[PDB]
Design a protein around this ligand. Structure first.
Ligand SMILES: Cc1cc(C(=O)O)c2c(C(C)C)nn(-c3ccc(Cl)cc3)c2n1
Lengths: 11, 263
């Protein structure tokens, strides 16, 4: 789970 | 109404824009005007109020170049965060596959960052620290390699970009076009992204025609600026790798390391 994906998966 | 929606998403998502910046740069920041940073003394004076002084995990007694590095990269981390939220508001972006969203942001964010950075730059220096500091161009050049080589190409780009006299309604569309670029390495749904690109580019083209009727060749000028930015980022990334490899005290934020990795 990359950090950019974390930003994109935000609510 | 695509042009208005993108302009609205830009104003909503970015803490800094050209209207807010020119207010501060013109000397109208009444409460909390910017600290002018023009030598080592005024850097330390500014840091006294603008940076928190931790007890052990601190940047206090790191080298000046490294303290500026940390301030600059933390601003970039927040701009990346804002750019991600901005992209999500671009119609069609959220329906892309997740890996394509990553790729577009991976290659786009720094072209957008240096485009938008022009808004806080003039010939003498640039705003930093959320509009609360102004660090002179000469002072940055006076630092030691390789840190003195980072900002000068960005000032050069910004002088010619600011000469086009775009406003925030223009820039918002320009950044959307940077992000929705069908040319990025490793993209999957190329055809659909090229059509998103075409749609945004079309709205940009129409917008420049309405907003800048005095310069009927403004659009190809801006196409050239997108190519200038991609080259500006590839050269910047090489400087970043030098610093990541040879500068022990310049610890790169993991989000930026992920963006630069394999770019
Ligand atoms: C506006 C800006 C962006 C970046 C960026 O890539 O996010 C950056 C970096 C990377 C190495 C993190 N370094 N610097 C920078 C460091 C010291 C000095 Cl004196 C001037 C500029 C930077 N500035």
């Amino acid at each position: 789970p990359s950090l950019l994906k974390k930003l994109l998966l935000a609510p | 109404s695509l042009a208005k929606r993108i302009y609205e998403a830009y104003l909503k998502n970015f803490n800094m824009n050209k209207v807010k910046a020119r207010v501060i740069l013109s000397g109208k920041a009444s409460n909390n005007p910017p600290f002018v940073i023009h030598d080592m003394e005024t850097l330390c004076m500014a840091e006294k109020t603008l940076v928190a002084k931790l007890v052990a995990n601190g940047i206090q007694n790191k080298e000046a170049e490294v303290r500026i590095f940390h301030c600059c990269q933390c601003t970039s981390v927040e701009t990346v965060t804002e750019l991600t939220e901005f992209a999500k508001a671009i119609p069609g972006f959220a329906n892309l596959d997740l890996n394509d969203q990553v790729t577009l942001l991976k290659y786009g964010v720094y072209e957008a960052i240096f485009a938008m950075l022009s808004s806080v730059m003039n010939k003498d220096g640039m705003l930093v620290a959320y509009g609360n500091g102004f660090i002179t161009r000469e002072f940055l050049k006076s630092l030691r390699k390789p840190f003195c080589d980072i900002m000068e190409p960005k000032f050069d780009f910004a002088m010619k970009f600011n000469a086009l006299e775009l406003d925030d309604s223009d820039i918002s569309l320009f950044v959307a076009a940077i992000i929705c670029c069908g040319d990025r390495p490793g993209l999957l749904n190329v055809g659909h992204i090229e059509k998103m690109q075409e749609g945004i580019v079309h709205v940009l083209r129409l917008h420049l025609q309405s907003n800048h009727p005095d310069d009927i060749f403004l659009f190809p000028k801006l196409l050239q600026k997108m190519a200038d930015l991609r080259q500006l980022v590839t050269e910047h990334a090489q400087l970043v790798q030098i610093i990541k490899k040879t500068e022990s005290d310049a610890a790169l934020h993991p989000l930026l390391q992920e963006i630069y990795r394999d770019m």
